[PDB]
Design a protein around this ligand. Structure first.
Ligand SMILES: *[C@@H]1O[C@H](CO)[C@@H](O[C@@H]2O[C@H](CO)[C@@H](O)[C@H](O)[C@@H]2O)[C@H](O)[C@H]1NC(C)=O
Ligand code: NAG
Lengths: 48, 97
C-alpha cells in the first residue's frame, strides 16, 4: 500500500507512514520496483 | 612506475556514464550487484574514457548487454553469463512477457 500508491506526495510535504504489527518480508519490496538506489546505511539490505 | 605486482588483472567492459561512478569498491546498483562487484579491499585503479566513435553509428546499435535481473547478488570477481527467465510470484514460467 506504500509502493502501490498513485499520488506519492511532494517532497515539501513528505508522506510519512508508520509500519507496525506486521511481518516484513522485503521480497514484496523487491518485486514492486526495478531499483536504482538501494543504498542502505544502518543495516545491510541482505541482512533484513 | 616504482611498484612491483605479483600479477595484474585487466577487466574491460564498456558501460553507461553513471555506472562509471557506480563502479567502485563497496557500492550498489544494477551493475555493482548483478553484473560486476569489486571486492572491498581492492588494490588497483579504474580507467574510463569516452568512446562514442566505436559504440555508435547511424540507425543505431544494440550489441551491448547488461544484467538487471539476478536471483542473488554477484560475488566479487565472478561472472554470471546465463539466460534464465527471472521468477516473479510462484510461476515456473519459462518465457517472456
Ligand atoms: C500516505 O499515502 C498512503 C497511501 O496513499 C496513505 O495510506 C492509505 O491512505 C488512505 C487514504 O488515502 C487510507 O484510507 C488507508 O487506510 C491508508 O492509510 C497514508 O495515509 C498517507 N499518509 C500521509 C501522511 O499522507
Ligand atoms: C498496483 O496495484 C495494481 C492492482 O491492480 C497492479 O495492477 C499494479 O501492478 C501495481 N503497481 C505497483 C507499482 O505497485
Amino acid at each position: 500500500e506504500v509502493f502501490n500508491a498513485t499520488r506519492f506526495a511532494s517532497v515539501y510535504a513528505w508522506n510519512r507512514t508508520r509500519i507496525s504489527n506486521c511481518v516484513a518480508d522485503y521480497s514484496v519490496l523487491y518485486n514492486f520496483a526495478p531499483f536504482f538506489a538501494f543504498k542502505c546505511y544502518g543495516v545491510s539490505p541482505t541482512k533484513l | 612506475n616504482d611498484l612491483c605486482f605479483t600479477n595484474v588483472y585487466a577487466d574491460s567492459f564498456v558501460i553507461k556514464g553513471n555506472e562509471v561512478s557506480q563502479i567502485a569498491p563497496g557500492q550498489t546498483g544494477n551493475i555493482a550487484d548483478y553484473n560486476y562487484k569489486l571486492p572491498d579491499d581492492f588494490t588497483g585503479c579504474v580507467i574510463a574514457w569516452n568512446s562514442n566513435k566505436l559504440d555508435s553509428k547511424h540507425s543505431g546499435n544494440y550489441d551491448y548487454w547488461y544484467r538487471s535481473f539476478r536471483k542473488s547478488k554477484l560475488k566479487p570477481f565472478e561472472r554470471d553469463i546465463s539466460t534464465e527467465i527471472y521468477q516473479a510470484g510462484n510461476k515456473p514460467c519459462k518465457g517472456k512477457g
